[PDB]
């Protein structure tokens, strides 16, 4: 009703509708630590949340209140759980709460207590109809927003709408292969409905992951996705594999392509494999390459890796 | 002839990013972070002047003594989270070895005690609701500060009721009463029960196997199951495991590949997720994994494990938070380009003191870039508190019997 950027705000204290409410001020003790000096409006308002809050006042105005509380730090926790008493004991409109929701969401895109209001608001109504677009929406302007996603998974799984969620997986992959979050959620369609057994399915997921790293052989998210799908079953039980990486090389070398050979071999090693030798060196030599040359920053992790092969491997 | 600096030899210019002329929203923010970082290296060479790293000791003990007593309204927003400037803080104060008072240390316990709930747990402030993330911030600060009065703040039996009020049928906890799971929630519950020795029989049951339904095919942990894996929810997983004593519910071997990976070759800091941003405070929640890995294999016999390093590149991350995140003002920050806060502060530098120390049984080996000076006290990786004050506490209150016995 009163907007806080309204030139025509006014201090709860000056509102003539509070006049029989004391506020309540901010009880920080004879001496302080870690002390805000907070604004003006700010401590206007909180000093009249705690007044409301402190008598479990359910009213209209209380409701509108909370609504400056939030606006002011939305991280308070104690602010919203106060007003979704509110939202109950005055019966008020879940969906005008939703829209409400909507619109702080879109501005404040990254706080956990937006998303959880949300979710409890979909769990009072049990109505996912609009969260799909919702939340592409936001994912449009930030494609990696670790609660987006979040919520998101939550409303695939609890309202089972997975129908048509590898579409978009492929719309997005397709403006940005490299976001890790589209790739995660990929294996996340996937695995909860086909699986990756589904050996039809598990060919076309490698021969898209193989073709993408093609286009951008630099790209550690396919790497990943397709180390993350094949390791499950055991490298070695691929043995095209081995080759198929090697013919790359040439023309796509990169230290994810020499460090995926590195993890066939070992588990080639693993498995008791022809040549309990020639591989290990082929491993070693490659350990090698990283540590000394190619991917440096990870030397203590390759010397590692070097190690462990040799204390395993050659008695 | 000869670069002491790792960030500064020749060699380091190929570490740039190689965009396979395919550019998406991903490289182009990528090679933009990487353009300022080379600025900053290359700005030895470009003023002709010989390079030397300092940690500006002095200005960062200034601002966190102001802070810790009063903030700008900047700080509005965290209102709801006072106990963690309060840890942040005073961790820092502890990292640089600088003497709390007396003084300080009583209100600091006056004022953790306003915040304490009558029901259990702490609220971000006095008289707000309590919740998990300020409970674990006020318990570590209590035991940095380790007195006796301290001590006796925590109310050992509410904050058990507290627990047990936030714990999930399938083994999780809630944040709050009314709020929502994940991984964080099960490390503070895990960090605050056995600093306070409140940790009974039945508390964690089913936590060890929901947090391992949390690595996901990445070989991180994400905050939920399916969720994608990040720096801070593995930590925490992996952390709360250790308390537990079940690193073993987890493959290991994929965590430690992936947590390796995400040391960027350019920066030499720390992304928090795989194709993101290098940045200051992963210094501390992904490099502070590999102490927390050393041990849990060593555990296991790992005959191959290193005597004197971690399984990072050391070197380079001080490199990176040394000249890239420290504020000439005070305070140090996320990368070039960015401001302050407490936060950043705290966390860049328990990753700089981890990145310093190295410690596996008898054997103790440090690595200090820069002038010798810059040496920080050590932190302990499962709490991030000194390993002193973690002995101190959990010594004291094992004097007492668990609630309930
Ligand atoms: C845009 O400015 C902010 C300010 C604070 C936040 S935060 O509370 O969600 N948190 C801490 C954090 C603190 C500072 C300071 N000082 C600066 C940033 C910051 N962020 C954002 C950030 C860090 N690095 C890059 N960015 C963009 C990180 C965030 C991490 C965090 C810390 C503690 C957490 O545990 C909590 O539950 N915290 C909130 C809380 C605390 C007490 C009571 C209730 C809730 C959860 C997440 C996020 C963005
Ligand atoms: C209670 C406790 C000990 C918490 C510590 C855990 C921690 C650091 C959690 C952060 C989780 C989160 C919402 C990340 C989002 O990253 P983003 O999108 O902001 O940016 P990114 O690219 O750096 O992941
Ligand atoms: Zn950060």
């Known amino acids: 009703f009163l907007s806080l950027d309204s030139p025509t705000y006014v201090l709860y204290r000056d509102r003539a509708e509070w006049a029989d409410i004391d506020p309540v001020p901010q009880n920080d003790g004879p001496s302080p630590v870690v002390q805000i000096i907070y604004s003006e409006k700010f401590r206007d308002v909180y000093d009249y949340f705690r007044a409301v809050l402190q008598r479990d006042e359910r009213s209209e105005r209380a409701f509108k209140l909370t609504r400056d509380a939030i606006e002011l730090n939305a991280a308070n926790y104690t602010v919203w759980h106060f007003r979704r008493v509110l939202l109950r004991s005055l019966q008020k409109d879940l969906q005008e709460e939703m829209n409400y929701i909507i619109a702080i969401i879109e501005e404040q895109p990254k706080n956990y207590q937006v998303w959880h209001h949300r979710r409890v608001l979909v769990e009072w109504l049990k109505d996912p109809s609009q969260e799909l677009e919702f939340i592409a929406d936001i994912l449009n302007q930030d494609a990696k927003n670790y609660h987006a996603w979040q919520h998101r998974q939550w409303v695939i799984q609890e309202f089972r709408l997975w129908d048509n969620e590898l579409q978009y997986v492929d719309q997005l992959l397709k403006e940005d292969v490299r976001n890790n979050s589209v790739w995660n959620q990929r294996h996340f369609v996937i695995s909860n409905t086909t699986g990756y057994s589904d050996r039809a399915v598990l060919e076309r997921e490698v021969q898209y992951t193989l073709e993408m790293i093609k286009l951008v052989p630099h790209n550690e998210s396919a790497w990943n996705y397709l180390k993350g799908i094949l390791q499950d079953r055991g490298l070695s039980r691929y043995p095209n594999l081995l080759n198929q990486l090697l013919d790359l090389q040439p023309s796509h070398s990169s230290p994810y392509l020499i460090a995926f050979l590195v993890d066939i071999y070992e588990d080639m090693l693993e498995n008791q494999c022809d040549n309990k030798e020639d591989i290990l060196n082929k491993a070693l030599e490659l350990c090698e390459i990283l540590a000394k040359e190619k991917d440096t920053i990870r030397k203590e992790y390759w010397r590692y890796i070097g190690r462990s092969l040799q204390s395993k491997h050659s008695r | ?405």
């Open chain 2, 1 to 405: 002839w000869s670069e002491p600096l790792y960030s500064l030899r020749p060699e380091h210019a190929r570490e740039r990013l190689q965009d396979d002329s395919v550019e998406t929203v991903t490289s182009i923010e990528q090679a933009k972070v990487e353009e300022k970082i080379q600025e900053v290296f290359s700005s030895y060479k470009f003023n002709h002047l010989v390079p030397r790293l300092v940690l500006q000791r002095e200005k960062h003990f200034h601002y966190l003594k102001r802070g810790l007593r009063q903030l700008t309204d900047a700080y509005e927003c965290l209102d709801a989270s006072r106990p963690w400037l309060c840890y942040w803080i005073l961790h820092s104060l502890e990292l640089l070895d600088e003497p709390i008072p007396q003084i300080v240390a009583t209100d600091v316990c006056q004022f953790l005690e306003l915040c304490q709930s009558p029901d259990g747990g702490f609220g971000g402030g006095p008289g707000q609701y309590p919740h998990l993330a300020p409970t674990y911030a006020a318990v570590n600060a209590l035991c940095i500060i380790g007195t006796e009065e301290a001590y006796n703040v925590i109310n050992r039996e509410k904050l058990l009721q507290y627990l047990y009020s936030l714990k999930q049928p399938d083994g999780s906890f809630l944040m709050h009463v009314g709020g929502e799971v994940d991984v964080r929630s099960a490390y503070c519950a895990a960090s605050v029960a056995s600093l306070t020795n409140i940790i009974t029989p039945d508390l964690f049951e089913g936590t060890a196997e929901w947090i391992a339904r949390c690595q996901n095919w990445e070989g991180g942990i994400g905050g939920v199951p399916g969720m994608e894996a990040h720096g801070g929810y593995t930590f925490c997983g992996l952390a709360a495991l250790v308390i537990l004593k079940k690193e073993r519910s987890l493959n290991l071997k994929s965590l430690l590949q992936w947590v390796t990976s995400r040391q960027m070759r350019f920066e030499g800091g720390f992304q928090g997720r795989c194709n993101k941003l290098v940045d200051g405070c992963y210094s501390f929640w992904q490099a502070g994994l590999l102490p927390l890995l050393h041990r849990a294999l060593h555990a296991q016999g790992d005959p191959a494990l290193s005597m004197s390093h971690w399984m990072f590149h050391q070197q380079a991350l001080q490199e990176y938070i040394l000249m890239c995140c420290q504020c000439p003002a005070g305070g140090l920050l996320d990368k070039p380009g960015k401001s302050r806060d407490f936060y950043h502060t705290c966390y860049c530098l328990s990753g700089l003191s981890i990145a310093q120390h190295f410690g596996s049984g008898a054997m103790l080996h440090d690595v200090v870039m820069g002038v010798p000076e810059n040496v920080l006290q050590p932190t302990h990786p499962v709490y991030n508190i000194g390993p002193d004050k973690v002995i101190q506490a959990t010594t004291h209150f094992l004097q007492k019997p668990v609630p309930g016995f």
